[model samples]
Target: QKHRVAPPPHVPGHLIREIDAYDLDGLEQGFHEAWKRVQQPDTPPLVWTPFTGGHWIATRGTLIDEIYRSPERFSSRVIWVPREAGEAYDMVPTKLDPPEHTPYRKAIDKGLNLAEIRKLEDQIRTIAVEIIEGFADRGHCEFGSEFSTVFPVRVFLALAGLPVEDATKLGLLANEMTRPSGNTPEEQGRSLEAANKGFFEYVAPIIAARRGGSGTDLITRILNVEIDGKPMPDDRALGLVSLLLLGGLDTVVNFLGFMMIYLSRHPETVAEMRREPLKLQRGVEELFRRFAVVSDARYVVSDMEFHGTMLKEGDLILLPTALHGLDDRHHDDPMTVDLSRRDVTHSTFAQGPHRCAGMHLARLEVTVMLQEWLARIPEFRLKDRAVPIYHSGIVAAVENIPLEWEPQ
Candidate 1:
């Protein structure tokens, strides 16, 4: 620990646990499973972690949600942990709180328009079908590179009205923003800053060209989006577009990779879903519960005693959305997947004000993939028993799912 600070006066010895949410070590077992250590029966709901620039972690799912919902107590000034990165990080709606947050949120909510998604539903299915068909007869394919990475990105580009050619460039930038690369805090902070700059640079021109124009694509719609019954300024509009691009590219990409990995290993789930057919919707929701991936944090607004732990102002509290679904106390037999389970819950899309704005569109994308892929591929299994690397960051992700099945 570089420049370790003593635990605050109220922090107890047992409460001082060493946990890294972005754990490469957790990949040995499971990325999301890392939460078990803090969510264990005896551990408190929140604990002090000296890792990642020394921050507090909300160990329980409920507490995590509480921190997200309570802006008065826990602010959104900085969402990421490791103070340098969090403080350096600035994205629209995400880094802002309520009232001031309303307009930007409106742009996103309206920008990823329900009207647009409904229009694109058939195209969404077509994208899934074409990608899956390209691999269906091949017997084996790298699920990540072949489909998960290709499918949603193409859809996002189509929605955003950006050239499909720009997908990789934008995707790489979006990735760095989430999973910064470097040895020290200074280096990683630079990576984060650079990635954000790249997105704005790429987006700024397109945003200007579309500015004040009447168009249907998300970017144009966002650019043309009105606030207080009028158009927003360039800075606000640019940030919104950049944030959406960053979000749309990586999230569904990682999620689909994890979903396919889980499904490829569990043929029983395929069989069950095929049987019920109707349950696939519920099953999708359950899968989201089990595979919840995002872990973001909030800033402590004031020096107050929170659930008996004294928190100082400017403290970053790490909140893992994965813990919410995996918490055994909340979900019966949390780790065991049951598509049939009732009232499944998770903060995967997050909760409260800053909840994921693209959620409905994301669900449509996932649902179409499942419907299209499963309909053609009768069955498949992982070609190797080995699991791929799962990157732990703002959004948790798996690298690849290589699978082979009998060719048609």
Candidate 2:
């Protein structure tokens, strides 16, 4: 019989501590406290808090790259832990080390290459325009549900040549996979199993049908690609498809939601962009730096000292992308989101080898949306009829961002 390891002593302590801290307003306060602690002059090089199973916080950006690049020493096997899904399904190169992982990544890289996605740029722009136009006259729309969620799924679906109706179902599955908010660990696991079953059932036959066919859609191309000079197995191909769908849908959806909310409130920033269309690229990069979505990493290797604290191998590290972006140590005035700020660098798509593979597509989509919306609907503000509330963890976002905009 296996003896279950005792839960950490700080588990109950942290819960009570968090509750007390939260009652005084938790998330924001905790974020500041953590940030302040990291920047302390005599800070212990590294600090290990027993909040969530005691993981080391990589307080600096450079160290974040160090950990991601040297996955061999740091390893990526158990990327996110407590294994919410129960089954250890490694999410591609994100969870795999070099040698074995590189080829699989290449397969995806080859498919989503810049030129390949550039072909769909116009299609993406049209999708963004259509979605924005739907609410352009209202001067107010629920940005998160109405715009952010719909646009990415539609674009991804169209690009994959999957039916539009499937976008809704896939969107829900993608959310459950990454943001099954408020579900217990067991519930999250069960939900994932059911979702995987449904997803595979839906895609399995599609893969079979597309195997011998020549097509331009990513699904068709990926299914036909050679891995290790041999065709990828149906399951592996399906796994890659599932990984991309979930990741692509979740990250961009949350990102745009954050972008809309931030930009709507900061109309001056919007006007500045309107004055200088060229700043759009820097605008996306700035928003990425400001509202980064990918935040944590679960350690899959042995424990070691970061700064000074002991990080046991297999410990989950919370990099806190948004928090890091706000850290004064990196950016002179991290709190302010300046479009013209010089010396700007961020890992919104993440850094090192695992940088967002779909970043080009994401950038193109956001840029086009901004361009078209700025030209067509310049006088919109977040609707005050409904209050906006932001909720985040694992991934951060505004749960409801109702905005009312008037078309010029």
Best by lDDT: 1
What lDDT is obtained when candidate 1 is compared to the true structure? Answer: 0.80
TM-score, candidate number 1 = 0.95
* CA lDDT scores, all candidates in order: 0.80, 0.64
On the 0 to 100 scale, the lDDT of residue 136 in model 2 is 78
Residues 162-241, candidate 1: write the lDDT tens digits: 78999989988977788787645666678888988888888888887888777778888766767888778777766778
TM-score for all models, in order of appearance: 0.95, 0.86
Weakest lDDT window of 10 consecutive positions for candidate 2: 15-24
Backbone clash total for model 2 is 12
Ten contiguous residues with the weakest lDDT in model 1: 1-10
Task: Estimate, for each residue in 89-194, the C-alpha lDDT of model 2 and write its tens digit.
Answer: 4345565667777777888887788888788888988888888778777666777878788888888887888888887788776655554433344454566567
